[PDB]
Design a protein around this ligand. Structure first.
Ligand SMILES: Cn1nc(-c2ccccc2)cc1C(=O)N[C@H](Cc1nc2ccccc2[nH]1)C(=O)O
Length: 145
């Protein structure tokens, strides 16, 4: 299996699934390092965010727990096909990159907060993360190149 992935057993279903402890990805199906990667993301900030403010709300007052619920809801919608990533990032990301549909452009190791970096470099092109926690808040990331 590729870096970060593990196989596990779901008790309720009786079927194996896979999860990546670097990206927090999880899925029933079995999955399958460059200078630079390209990612879009969706950030939901909370009150312990480093800068608890965005283009959406001058003061962010939601708890970390609440921002986790919001992220979990976004994930559910992307995974069902109800909404697609770029679209929810444009409308709802607490990052100024919302206006680029969440695109951050290409970057190398050194540039982004380490948890965000590791997740991005653990994803393959086209793959999506689970909740990834930084000092900025909680993200979903989609690696595009
Ligand atoms: C790193 N970056 N790029 C953009 C960006 C990209 C394209 C167009 C406009 C803004 C915004 C940012 C940024 O740091 N935004 C922060 C939120 C944030 N914190 C991050 C931590 C790690 C990775 C991305 C992150 N984004 C903010 O606005 O409060």
């Amino acid at each position: 299996l590729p870096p970060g992935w593990e196989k596990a057993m779901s008790r309720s279903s009786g079927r194996v699934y896979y999860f990546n402890h670097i990206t927090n990805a999880s899925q029933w199906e079995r999955p399958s390092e460059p200078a630079r990667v390209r990612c879009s993301h969706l950030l939901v900030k909370h009150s312990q965010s480093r800068r608890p403010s965005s283009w959406r709300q001058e003061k962010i007052t939601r708890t970390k727990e609440e921002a986790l619920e919001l992220i979990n809801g976004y994930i559910q919608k992307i995974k069902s096909g109800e909404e697609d990533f770029e679209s929810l990032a444009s409308q709802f990301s607490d990052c100024s990159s919302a206006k680029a549909r969440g695109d951050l452009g290409a970057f190398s190791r050194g540039q982004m907060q380490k948890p965000f970096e590791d997740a991005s470099f653990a994803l393959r092109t086209g793959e999506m993360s689970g909740p990834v926690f930084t000092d900025s808040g909680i993200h979903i990331i989609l690696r595009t190149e």
